[PDB]
Amino acid sequence: AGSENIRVKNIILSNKHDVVKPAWLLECFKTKSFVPWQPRFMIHMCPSTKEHFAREYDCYGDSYFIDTDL
Amino acid sequence: MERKISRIHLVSEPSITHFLQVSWEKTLESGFVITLTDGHSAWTGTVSESEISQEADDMAMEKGKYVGELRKALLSGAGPADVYTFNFSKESCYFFFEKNLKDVSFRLGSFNLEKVENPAEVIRELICYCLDTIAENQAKNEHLQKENERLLRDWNDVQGRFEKCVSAKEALETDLYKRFILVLNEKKTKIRSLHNKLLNA
Amino acid sequence: KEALETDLYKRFILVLNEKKTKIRSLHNKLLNA
Numbered sequence: 001a002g003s004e005n006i007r008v009k010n011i012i013l014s015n016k017h018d019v020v021k022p023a024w025l026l027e028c029f030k031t032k033s034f035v036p037w038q039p040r041f042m043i044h045m046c047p048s049t050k051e052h053f054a055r056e057y058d059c060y061g062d063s064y065f066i067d068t069d070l
Numbered sequence: 071m072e073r074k075i076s077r078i079h080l081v082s083e084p085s086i087t088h089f090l091q092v093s094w095e096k097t098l099e100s101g102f103v104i105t106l107t108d109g110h111s112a113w114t115g116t117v118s119e120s121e122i123s124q125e126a127d128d129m130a131m132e133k134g135k136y137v138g139e140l141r142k143a144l145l146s147g148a149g150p151a152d153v154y155t156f157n158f159s160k161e162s163c164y165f166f167f168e169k170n171l172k173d174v175s176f177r178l179g180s181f182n183l184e185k186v187e188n189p190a191e192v193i194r195e196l197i198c199y200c201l202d203t204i205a206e207n208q209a210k211n212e213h214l215q216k217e218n219e220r221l222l223r224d225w226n227d228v229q230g231r232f233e234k235c236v237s238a239k240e241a242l243e244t245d246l247y248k249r250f251i252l253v254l255n256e257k258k259t260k261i262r263s264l265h266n267k268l269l270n271a
Numbered sequence: 272k273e274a275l276e277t278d279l280y281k282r283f284i285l286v287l288n289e290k291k292t293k294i295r296s297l298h299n300k301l302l303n304a
Binding site for chain 3: 235239242243246250253254257260261264265267268271
């Protein structure tokens with residue numbers, strides 16, 4: 001959901017699903033590959049995904065193992 | 071203390087100009103002293119508050135309006151469209167000025183001046199006043215020009231410095247970002263090395 | 272200029288502090304294993 005409407009807010013209230021910005025599909029189409037998620041695209045995190053990205057990524061978009069660009 | 075010198079064309083002999091100097095303390099309302107000259111002989115007269123008030127009352131005019139009209143006529147305050155005609159009967163020593171209004175003339179003021187025995191003194195005083203005022207004006211103009219030149223130079227310098235600063239702003243921003251990414255990549259390498267060592271252990 | 276510099280430096284030192292906390296935790300847990 002690219003617009004945080006009432007449905008998006010209701011899904012946010014429940015912690016059983018993950019929201020991703022529509023740019024993820026466009027990026028997949030351009031690369032024609034199943035690229036994994038990034039904190040920039042997603043606006044919400046499930047507890048499992050939150051734990052998964054906590055190890056790989058930091059409290060913000062910055063990560064540890066993968067370098068960063070401008 | 072103020073004084074104004076003006077040029078006039080007497081209708082009796084409208085070929086040679088005359089010069090009239092009128093001096094007042096604060097405003098023409100209280101009074102003033104007038105002196106007419108032509109380069110050979112001069113006449114002088116004075117107008118007081120009582121005389122001007124009586125003349126205005128005879129005119130059935132507001133004091134402010136009469137004072138303004140007198141200032142316009144005597145201080146060379148010519149308006150966009152207005153002609154004033156002056157004439158001085160020498161035999162009767164009577165000088166009066168009127169406001170010509172396109173074939174209807176309205177006499178504005180009239181006085182009786184006394185022929186001063188010594189015209190040389192008044193001419194010399196007028197010349198001295200003119201020289202003093204021109205010297206003062208020249209000094210003021212020189213000072214103002216110097217100040218303007220200095221201010222223009224300072225403004226040019228400040229504008230150049232501002233251009234340099236705005237140009238360097240982007241360079242500073244990009245240098246800061248580059249340094250940021252350098253140190254961040256160093257920290258990423260450090261964390262990667264620590265993770266690899268932990269995995270090996 | 273001053274506002275931009277201070278804001279950028281504050282953000283950067285915050286990020287550096289977080290990364291330093293993470294590396295300190297990694298070093299602390301390295302000793303036990």
